[PDB]
Symmetry: C2
Subunit: 129 residues, 2 copies
């Protein structure tokens, strides 16, 4: 498959990339990802699908991932959005921005369930193909 | 655009109902719909829209596993939850269901009516 990631924090964007390599190899299914913390570069991958891992509080701007999530939802209606953030209280807010948020996963949690809740977000996708 | 409603409660399945007609008229939009209180015949309608309740008939978390069914047969679809269960809002993510909204039903008819327009106008924009 192929994954698009929006994380401007390296520590937080390298934690994920390790999880994805574990899962792909543990599950024996390929995975390719692109990663950035540059919004306009991210949109270059939509300007000219399918699984999207988005952070929210980006570059001093909280609720930025929400904004880009709308943008993605515009270009691809049936795209998959997964929210990853340290901002707990945004679990409610995903509805406001009218995004079909498959998942909203907190990052301030133990490494073990962390890797698990991602497999779900991928078992979902393979099934959807 | 057709609408599918899943509410077991009469005084609540008509609150939303009349709103649909208003909007349908107020914004001049054709809105067709069929509503039921039982899950079993809801499946017939499948196997645009969904307004599933959750704590359906004495058993909570039911509307969740129904939307999960809709999602399998209809991945394309738009799903809206409407409950008094204001603590299930964080749950929707768990049931692998990409819902559009989650409406705490126990709100005033002013704000309540508003909230439904978003979903309808969303669909309107999505077609």
């Amino acid at each position: 498959m192929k994954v698009l990631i929006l994380e401007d924090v390296i520590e937080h964007q390298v934690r994920l990339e390790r999880i994805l390599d574990e899962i792909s190899k543990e599950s024996n299914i390929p995975i390719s990802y692109k990663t950035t913390g540059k919004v306009r570069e991210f949109e270059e991958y939509i300007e000219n699908n399918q699984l999207y891992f988005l952070a929210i509080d980006i570059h001093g701007i909280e609720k930025k991932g929400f904004e880009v999530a709308q943008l993605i939802r515009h270009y691809n209606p049936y795209a998959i959005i997964v929210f990853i953030t340290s901002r707990s209280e945004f679990a409610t807010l995903t509805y406001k921005y009218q995004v079909s948020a498959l998942d909203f996963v907190d990052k301030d949690i133990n490494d073990e369930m962390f890797k698990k809740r991602i497999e779900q977000n991928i078992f979902y996708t393979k099934s959807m193909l």
